[PDB]
Structures are given as C-alpha cells and as structure tokens.
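Handout for the seminar on molecular recognition.
Each group receives one record of this type.
Step one: identify the two inputs.
Step two: read the structure output and locate the region that could contact protoporphyrin IX containing FE.
Step three: write two sentences on what you found, then compare them with the reference statements printed after the record.
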Amino acid sequence: GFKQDIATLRGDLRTYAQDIFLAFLNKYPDEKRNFKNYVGKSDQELKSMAKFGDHTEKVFNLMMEVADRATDCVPLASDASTLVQMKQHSGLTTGNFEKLFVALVEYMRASGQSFDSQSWDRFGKNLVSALSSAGMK
Ligand code: HEM
C-alpha cells in the first residue's frame, strides 16, 4: 500500500525522482516556465546536469517525508505550511502541484509494479487541499 510504496520509492529515489519529474515536465511542457535552465534539453541531457539531479532528488526526499508523516494519506498542516512558505515556491499555485501528482499517478499506473496509485492520487488531492488551507493560491 501507500507506506510500502514510500519504501519502494526510497529504495531507488534518485531514479524514481528523475523519471517522475521528467514525466511531469513532458506531460505539461508549459510547466518548464518555472524552470528556465531545463528548456531545450532532452531527458538524457537533463539527467546529466548535476542541478537537475540535485534539485529533483531533494524534492522527492521531502515528498517522501511528507508522505511518511501523513495519516491515511492526509499530510500534516505543518508540512503544507512549509511547502507554501518555501521561497523557491513563491511563484506556485496548487495547480502546479496537482499536475505533479497527476503525472506521478500516471507514472505509477503505467509501471509494471503494484503501486497503490489510488492512495497517491488521494495523497495528491489532500496535499493540494492542505496547501490551499495554508494559503497557496
Ligand atoms: C510535494 C511536492 C513538492 C515538494 C515536496 C517540493 C520540494 C522542494 C524542495 C525540497 C526544493 C529545494 C531543493 C533545493 O534546495 O535545491 C524545491 C525547489 C523548487 N521547487 Fe519544489 N517541491 C514540490 C513541488 C513543486 C512543484 C509542483 C513545482 C512547480 C510546478 C515546484 C517548483 C520548485 C522550484 C522551481 C524550485 C527551485 C528550482 C531550482 O533551483 O531547481 N515544486 N522544491
């Protein structure tokens, strides 16, 4: 289920983080606006860049912690607040995070693995709600 999925993702986090983030950037190319440094690069190019690798893995590091601290796929208010008040996210709306979670769910549905896609989908909605409550537009 959800908790095991966390363990699975963490067992190969760098690879999962990159592949899910690339699936996000490719599904929603207009989302490349928030990452100027990534424009005009194939997936392999993006993976060569140390920053892509760095940033993305740190995103998933924190995502998995938020997932880990959730109850029944409902994240802590404190975690949502942190994500909203992060300066790197000054630009973002919950639509940005929605899209990330649609691509993550899709990724999981298309994997051969028994991910609990429905829980991640609930988790994504719950987080979007919690980001709203914590003041993200
Ligand atoms: C659960 C969801 C998310 C988590 C846990 C998260 C976490 C993080 C973390 C930890 C960093 C800092 C990494 C560093 O210091 O280098 C970061 C930076 C950033 N995040 Fe997020 N993030 C999430 C969703 C998003 C989404 C949906 C977007 C845009 C649609 C976004 C855009 C960014 C940007 C633009 C940066 C700075 C860019 C850079 O220098 O590479 N994040 N995020």
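Reference statements: The pocket of protoporphyrin IX containing FE is lined by residues 31, 34-35, 54-55, 58-59, 62-63, 66, 83, 88-89, 92, 96-97, 100 (CB under 6 Å). The chain is about 70% helix and 0% strand.
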